[PDB]
PDB file of C-alpha atoms (C1' of nucleotides) in Angstrom:
ATOM      1  CA  UNK A 542     187.059 153.725  64.510  1.00 17.56           C
ATOM      2  CA  UNK A 543     189.209 156.550  65.900  1.00 19.45           C
ATOM      3  CA  UNK A 544     190.659 157.269  61.923  1.00 20.67           C
ATOM      4  CA  UNK A 545     186.820 158.420  60.941  1.00 20.54           C
ATOM      5  CA  UNK A 546     186.103 161.023  63.744  1.00 20.46           C
ATOM      6  CA  UNK A 547     187.756 164.405  64.449  1.00 16.36           C
ATOM      7  CA  UNK A 548     190.939 164.790  65.977  1.00 13.08           C
ATOM      8  CA  UNK A 549     188.629 166.678  68.591  1.00 14.76           C
ATOM      9  CA  UNK A 550     186.757 163.903  69.165  1.00 14.72           C
ATOM     10  CA  UNK A 551     189.126 162.275  70.686  1.00 16.12           C
ATOM     11  CA  UNK A 552     189.393 164.118  73.982  1.00 16.53           C
ATOM     12  CA  UNK A 553     188.115 160.829  75.893  1.00 13.35           C
ATOM     13  CA  UNK A 554     189.711 158.269  74.690  1.00 14.58           C
ATOM     14  CA  UNK A 555     193.636 158.801  75.633  1.00 17.76           C
ATOM     15  CA  UNK A 556     193.625 160.719  78.721  1.00 16.67           C
ATOM     16  CA  UNK A 557     195.430 157.754  80.909  1.00 19.07           C
ATOM     17  CA  UNK A 558     197.976 157.553  78.784  1.00 17.70           C
ATOM     18  CA  UNK A 559     198.588 161.249  78.829  1.00 14.38           C
ATOM     19  CA  UNK A 560     199.006 160.462  82.682  1.00 16.35           C
ATOM     20  CA  UNK A 561     201.292 157.582  82.029  1.00 15.78           C
ATOM     21  CA  UNK A 562     203.910 159.213  79.933  1.00 15.07           C
ATOM     22  CA  UNK A 563     203.780 162.748  82.198  1.00 15.20           C
ATOM     23  CA  UNK A 564     204.449 160.192  85.258  1.00 17.01           C
ATOM     24  CA  UNK A 565     207.501 158.626  83.193  1.00 14.55           C
ATOM     25  CA  UNK A 566     208.794 161.837  82.040  1.00 11.63           C
ATOM     26  CA  UNK A 567     210.166 162.779  85.139  1.00 10.60           C
ATOM     27  CA  UNK A 568     211.382 160.007  86.481  1.00  8.33           C
ATOM     28  CA  UNK A 569     214.089 158.731  83.397  1.00  6.95           C
ATOM     29  CA  UNK A 570     214.447 161.868  80.848  1.00  6.41           C
ATOM     30  CA  UNK A 571     212.872 165.229  82.423  1.00  5.13           C
ATOM     31  CA  UNK A 572     210.489 166.116  79.203  1.00  2.01           C
ATOM     32  CA  UNK A 573     211.435 163.961  76.896  1.00  2.91           C
ATOM     33  CA  UNK A 574     208.239 163.797  74.536  1.00  2.39           C
ATOM     34  CA  UNK A 575     209.895 162.796  71.304  1.00  2.00           C
ATOM     35  CA  UNK A 576     211.873 159.704  71.854  1.00  2.00           C
ATOM     36  CA  UNK A 577     209.538 158.071  74.599  1.00  2.00           C
ATOM     37  CA  UNK A 578     206.685 157.777  71.702  1.00  2.53           C
ATOM     38  CA  UNK A 579     209.407 157.136  68.819  1.00  2.00           C
ATOM     39  CA  UNK A 580     210.744 154.395  69.971  1.00  2.00           C
ATOM     40  CA  UNK A 581     207.792 152.910  71.419  1.00  2.00           C
ATOM     41  CA  UNK A 582     206.062 153.537  68.040  1.00  2.00           C
ATOM     42  CA  UNK A 583     208.775 152.709  65.657  1.00  2.00           C
ATOM     43  CA  UNK A 584     209.239 149.533  67.187  1.00  2.00           C
ATOM     44  CA  UNK A 585     205.437 148.362  68.133  1.00  2.77           C
ATOM     45  CA  UNK A 586     204.962 148.984  64.320  1.00  2.00           C
ATOM     46  CA  UNK A 587     207.894 146.544  63.386  1.00  2.00           C
ATOM     47  CA  UNK A 588     205.720 143.923  66.034  1.00  2.00           C
ATOM     48  CA  UNK A 589     203.639 142.846  62.718  1.00  2.00           C
ATOM     49  CA  UNK A 590     206.502 143.296  60.441  1.00  2.00           C
ATOM     50  CA  UNK A 591     206.226 144.673  57.084  1.00  2.00           C
ATOM     51  CA  UNK A 592     209.248 146.990  56.244  1.00  2.00           C
ATOM     52  CA  UNK A 593     207.304 148.827  54.091  1.00  2.00           C
ATOM     53  CA  UNK A 594     206.632 151.555  56.466  1.00  2.00           C
ATOM     54  CA  UNK A 595     209.821 150.768  58.636  1.00  2.00           C
ATOM     55  CA  UNK A 596     211.748 152.723  55.730  1.00  2.00           C
ATOM     56  CA  UNK A 597     208.895 155.830  56.251  1.00  2.00           C
ATOM     57  CA  UNK A 598     209.043 155.552  60.044  1.00  2.00           C
ATOM     58  CA  UNK A 599     213.117 155.899  60.315  1.00  5.24           C
ATOM     59  CA  UNK A 600     213.725 159.110  58.167  1.00  4.44           C
ATOM     60  CA  UNK A 601     210.441 160.561  59.452  1.00  2.00           C
ATOM     61  CA  UNK A 602     212.485 163.046  61.973  1.00  2.00           C
ATOM     62  CA  UNK A 603     216.399 163.315  61.853  1.00  2.00           C
ATOM     63  CA  UNK A 604     217.342 162.287  58.395  1.00  2.00           C
ATOM     64  CA  UNK A 605     216.868 163.694  55.999  1.00  2.00           C
ATOM     65  CA  UNK A 606     214.394 166.416  55.428  1.00  2.00           C
ATOM     66  CA  UNK A 607     211.090 164.876  55.726  1.00  2.00           C
ATOM     67  CA  UNK A 608     210.131 166.088  53.531  1.00  2.00           C
ATOM     68  CA  UNK A 609     212.930 167.807  51.415  1.00  2.00           C
ATOM     69  CA  UNK A 610     215.418 169.473  53.871  1.00  2.00           C
ATOM     70  CA  UNK A 611     215.108 173.144  53.726  1.00  2.00           C
ATOM     71  CA  UNK A 612     218.670 173.633  52.948  1.00  2.00           C
ATOM     72  CA  UNK A 613     217.581 171.614  49.629  1.00  2.00           C
ATOM     73  CA  UNK A 614     214.793 173.354  49.210  1.00  2.00           C
ATOM     74  CA  UNK A 615     216.794 176.736  48.880  1.00  2.00           C
ATOM     75  CA  UNK A 616     218.805 175.059  46.739  1.00  2.00           C
ATOM     76  CA  UNK A 617     216.358 174.080  44.251  1.00  2.00           C
ATOM     77  CA  UNK A 618     215.192 177.459  44.469  1.00  2.00           C
ATOM     78  CA  UNK A 619     218.486 179.782  43.907  1.00  2.00           C
TER      79      UNK A 619
ATOM     80  C1'  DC B   1     153.871 141.804  68.969  1.00  2.00           C
ATOM     81  C1'  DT B   2     154.056 147.194  67.378  1.00  2.00           C
ATOM     82  C1'  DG B   3     153.915 151.732  67.848  1.00  2.00           C
ATOM     83  C1'  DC B   4     155.944 156.898  69.834  1.00  2.00           C
ATOM     84  C1'  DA B   5     156.983 159.941  73.781  1.00  2.00           C
ATOM     85  C1'  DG B   6     160.477 160.405  76.185  1.00  2.00           C
ATOM     86  C1'  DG B   7     163.592 158.639  80.175  1.00  2.00           C
ATOM     87  C1'  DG B   8     168.448 157.898  80.828  1.00  5.66           C
ATOM     88  C1'  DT B   9     172.949 156.048  78.565  1.00  6.84           C
ATOM     89  C1'  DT B  10     177.854 157.468  75.877  1.00  6.30           C
ATOM     90  C1'  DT B  11     180.158 160.025  72.626  1.00  5.27           C
ATOM     91  C1'  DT B  12     180.832 163.829  69.376  1.00  6.37           C
ATOM     92  C1'  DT B  13     181.019 168.697  68.665  1.00  7.10           C
ATOM     93  C1'  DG B  14     182.468 172.276  70.373  1.00  8.40           C
ATOM     94  C1'  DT B  15     181.714 175.426  74.532  1.00  9.35           C
ATOM     95  C1'  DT B  16     184.432 180.281  77.328  1.00  6.54           C
ATOM     96  C1'  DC B  17     190.213 181.968  78.055  1.00  5.80           C
ATOM     97  C1'  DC B  18     194.299 183.304  79.096  1.00  7.06           C
ATOM     98  C1'  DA B  19     199.901 182.604  78.035  1.00  9.74           C
ATOM     99  C1'  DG B  20     201.618 181.486  74.303  1.00  9.12           C
ATOM    100  C1'  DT B  21     203.741 178.833  68.758  1.00  6.32           C
ATOM    101  C1'  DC B  22     202.726 179.205  63.930  1.00  5.51           C
ATOM    102  C1'  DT B  23     200.857 180.297  58.889  1.00  4.81           C
ATOM    103  C1'  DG B  24     199.056 183.065  55.571  1.00  5.60           C
ATOM    104  C1'  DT B  25     197.700 187.110  53.312  1.00  2.68           C
ATOM    105  C1'  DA B  26     197.570 192.745  53.916  1.00  6.04           C
ATOM    106  C1'  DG B  27     200.491 197.457  53.395  1.00  4.64           C
ATOM    107  C1'  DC B  28     204.541 199.134  50.794  1.00  4.94           C
ATOM    108  C1'  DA B  29     206.215 202.297  45.751  1.00  4.74           C
ATOM    109  C1'  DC B  30     206.768 200.865  41.732  1.00  2.63           C
ATOM    110  C1'  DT B  31     207.771 197.763  36.417  1.00  2.00           C
ATOM    111  C1'  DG B  32     206.296 196.701  31.778  1.00  2.00           C
ATOM    112  C1'  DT B  33     203.838 195.673  27.439  1.00  2.00           C
ATOM    113  C1'  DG B  34     202.766 200.610  24.474  1.00  2.00           C
ATOM    114  C1'  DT B  35     208.916 202.797  19.776  1.00  2.00           C
ATOM    115  C1'  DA B  36     208.591 206.433  12.843  1.00  2.00           C
ATOM    116  C1'  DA B  37     207.481 207.814   8.639  1.00  2.00           C
ATOM    117  C1'  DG B  38     204.307 210.792   6.386  1.00  2.00           C
ATOM    118  C1'  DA B  39     201.430 214.962   5.597  1.00  2.00           C
ATOM    119  C1'  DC B  40     201.069 220.179   4.773  1.00  2.00           C
ATOM    120  C1'  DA B  41     202.027 225.297   4.338  1.00  2.00           C
ATOM    121  C1'  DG B  42     205.365 228.451   2.891  1.00  2.00           C
ATOM    122  C1'  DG B  43     209.691 230.189   0.472  1.00  2.00           C
ATOM    123  C1'  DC B  44     212.630 230.182  -3.306  1.00  2.00           C
ATOM    124  C1'  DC B  45     215.391 229.416  -6.801  1.00  2.00           C
ATOM    125  C1'  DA B  46     216.669 227.804 -11.606  1.00  2.00           C
ATOM    126  C1'  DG B  47     215.741 226.857 -15.776  1.00  2.00           C
ATOM    127  C1'  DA B  48     212.736 227.445 -19.596  1.00  2.00           C
ATOM    128  C1'  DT B  49     210.335 231.144 -22.388  1.00  2.00           C
ATOM    129  C1'  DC B  50     209.241 235.984 -24.924  1.00  2.00           C
TER     130       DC B  50
END
DNA sequence: CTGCAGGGTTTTTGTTCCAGTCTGTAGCACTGTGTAAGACAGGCCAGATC
């Protein structure tokens, strides 16, 4: 399983999906790498759905921190 | 059937370099913990004594 090999190892696998995402970025967004993968993965995880990850996947990017936000780290240091 | 050599096969695993972008340690000049009375030699004076 690819989860056991190195990250360098994976070179051969995802060529076609990189081509597809580069072609898709042009016609609808213009270069938005984040969203096209985020809304795909967060929703595909909920295909066979346990909410244990739905919490982990929701706060991952925007709110808040992930990990603790930099301002919270600054306050807990000062 | 087996044995081993050596053919191809995919898939690591890493192969060269230049824009970068990010991370982690090096260089700078300097800190703070070292924290008290006692020994000794000389000058002298005051009270005792003949």
